[PDB]
Every structure is written in C-alpha cells, then in structure tokens.
Symmetry: C2
Subunit: 51 residues, 2 copies
C-alpha cells in the first residue's frame, strides 16, 4: 500500500533526518574535536608558557 | 507505492546505515572529544599546576 511505503519512507526519511541529526552531531563533534584539540593545544601552548 | 515499502525499507536500511555511520562517528568523535577533553583538562589542570 501507500501506507507500507509511507511507513517504510517515514523510516527512510526519518533515517535521512536522523542522518542529518547524526551528521549534525558527528560534524559538530568533529568541529569540537578540532575545538577540543585546539583548546587542548591552547592549554598545551599555555602549559609551555606557564612551564 | 507497492514496491516503495521495499524501496523505502532498503532506503531506510541505507539511510539507517548512513545515520548509523554518522552516529557511530558521533560516538567515536564523542569518545575522542571526551579523550581530548580529559587530555585538555589534563593540560588545563596542568596549566594550573604550572600557573
């Protein structure tokens, strides 16, 4: 039916939306691995300045 | 419609595979962000130890 495709599509479309959300989380987490690594190296560069 | 439950189920399997690859990345990047944060706090608490 249209309801089988709509439910399978709601799963696929929501999975694409969840891929957007999962990608939003993973890309933001990669941006924040850069933020964390950059602030880790901010702190490391500052460790040397304080050391 | 009739085969779009199957096309959208396979699309859901792929979209779930890609949301999962993005989410598996979100988890790996979360583990890395937390590892970087623990190292950042390692360096930040050490920035204080030197400061």
């Amino acid at each position: 039916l249209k309801l089988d495709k709509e439910n399978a599509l709601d799963r696929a479309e929501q999975a694409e939306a969840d891929k957007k959300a999962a990608e939003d989380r993973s890309k933001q987490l990669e941006d924040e691995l850069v933020s964390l690594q950059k602030k880790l190296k901010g702190t490391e560069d500052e460790l040397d300045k304080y050391s």
